[PDB]
């Protein structure tokens, strides 16, 4: 037997995906996201196993020009990789989502500022739902439990973030 | 609570589980699309494994990090427009690119581009394919025999998970 983990950067894809696995008859369905809104939606749809992809930033560039989105993303990717980050990128409609993990809080504030600079240059909107601090994770994990999460797993490429949350838990 | 160590580097993975073990983590899992990393985790005594199913793992080697980043931007550009989910990590010597969420046609496009880029740049590439559910099932059985007790499977591509469910 196996647990099937749906990794989703958007709420609509995650619902569609868990619905497909439920129709297909998967016994053990989990949802993974750095977005606590998506993890809440999963639990409300009746998912009992949640993976918190914690730490770092989710930077979302929105605009009709996909060339401008990719250009901004490539620049951000370059800056993030130089600091030793793990970067996950997905182009979804008019939104380009960049997940950044494994850089210190001082470096994230730098990438926050850069994201604002790049947004102006290429004339696009940028929103940073980042945070991911171990303290915030500990708070939102309790909320997910109270919403009906039975199994909570936590994931990172950054062991220090796992060690900080281990310390707090 | 289970602590999942995401790894595309075998050495970093082993250092990371050691740190969590010393720190007092009771439930540790290792996640990777690289079956050799999952083998190394199980051989080190990890009993929970997340198989990151499907797509490609592309490893660029034999040039400076600045050059590896330029190659990464070229590959990302192609992958993003085909609608792929792309994870990129610059690791010491090598640049590792994980590509998922697209059919074989697009993977072949990116295999070819990675090879072209490697030649065009003058760098070495290791294009690790073999991301089909059929093989994943055979890899999963191998990992069980090596000593994995809990096997979790993960994808952004629900189609890949559905085909695995059918074949399982
Ligand atoms: Na809610
Ligand atoms: Na603790
Ligand atoms: Na996949
Ligand atoms: Tb994962």
Description:
- The structure is a homodimer.
- Chain A is an alpha/beta fold.
- Chain A contains six helices and eight strands, in the order E-H-E-H-E-E-H-E-E-H-E-H-E-H.
- Chain A has helices spanning 11-24, 36-44, 66-82, 105-121, 134-147, 159-168, and strands at residues 3-7, 28-33, 49-53, 57-62, 86-92, 95-101, 125-129, 151-156.
- In chain A, the strands form two sheets. Chain A has a four-stranded parallel β-sheet with strand order 1-2-3-8. A four-stranded antiparallel β-sheet of chain A has the order 5-6-4-7, covered by helices on one side.
- The longest helix of chain A is centred in the middle third of the chain and has 17 residues, at 66-82.
- The complex binds sodium ion (3 copies) and terbium(III) ion (TB).
- The site of one sodium ion has 3 residues of chain A, from helix 6.
Give the SSE map.
The structure is a homodimer.
Chain A: E1 3-7, H1 11-24, E2 28-33, H2 36-44, E3 49-53, E4 57-62, H3 66-82, E5 86-92, E6 95-101, H4 105-121, E7 125-129, H5 134-147, E8 151-156, H6 159-168
Parallel strand pairs in A: 1-2, 2-3, 3-8
Antiparallel strand pairs in A: 4-6, 4-7, 5-6
Helix pairs in contact in A: 1-2, 3-4, 5-6
PDB class: de novo protein
Keywords: TIM barrel, Enzyme Engineering, Metal Coordination, Photoenzyme, ProteinMPNN, DE novo protein
Assembly: dimeric
């Amino acid at each position: 037997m196996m647990t099937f983990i749906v990794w989703a950067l958007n709420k609509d894809e995650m619902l569609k995906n868990i619905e497909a696995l439920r129709k297909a008859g998967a016994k053990n369905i989990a949802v993974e996201s750095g977005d606590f809104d998506i993890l809440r939606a999963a639990i409300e749809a009746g998912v009992e196993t949640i993976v918190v992809s914690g730490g770092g930033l989710t930077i979302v560039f929105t605009g009709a020009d996909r060339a401008a989105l990719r250009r901004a993303a490539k620049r951000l990717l370059d800056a993030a990789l130089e600091l030793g980050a793990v970067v996950t990128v997905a182009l979804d409609g008019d939104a380009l989502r960049v997940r950044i993990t494994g850089v210190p809080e001082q470096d994230l504030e730098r990438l926050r500022a850069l994201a604002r600079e790049l947004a102006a240059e290429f004339g696009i909107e940028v929103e940073v739902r980042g945070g991911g601090t171990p303290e915030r994770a500990l708070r939102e994990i309790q909320e997910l439990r109270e919403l009906g999460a039975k199994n909570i797993w936590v994931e990172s490429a950054n062991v220090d973030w796992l060690l900080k949350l281990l310390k707090l838990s």
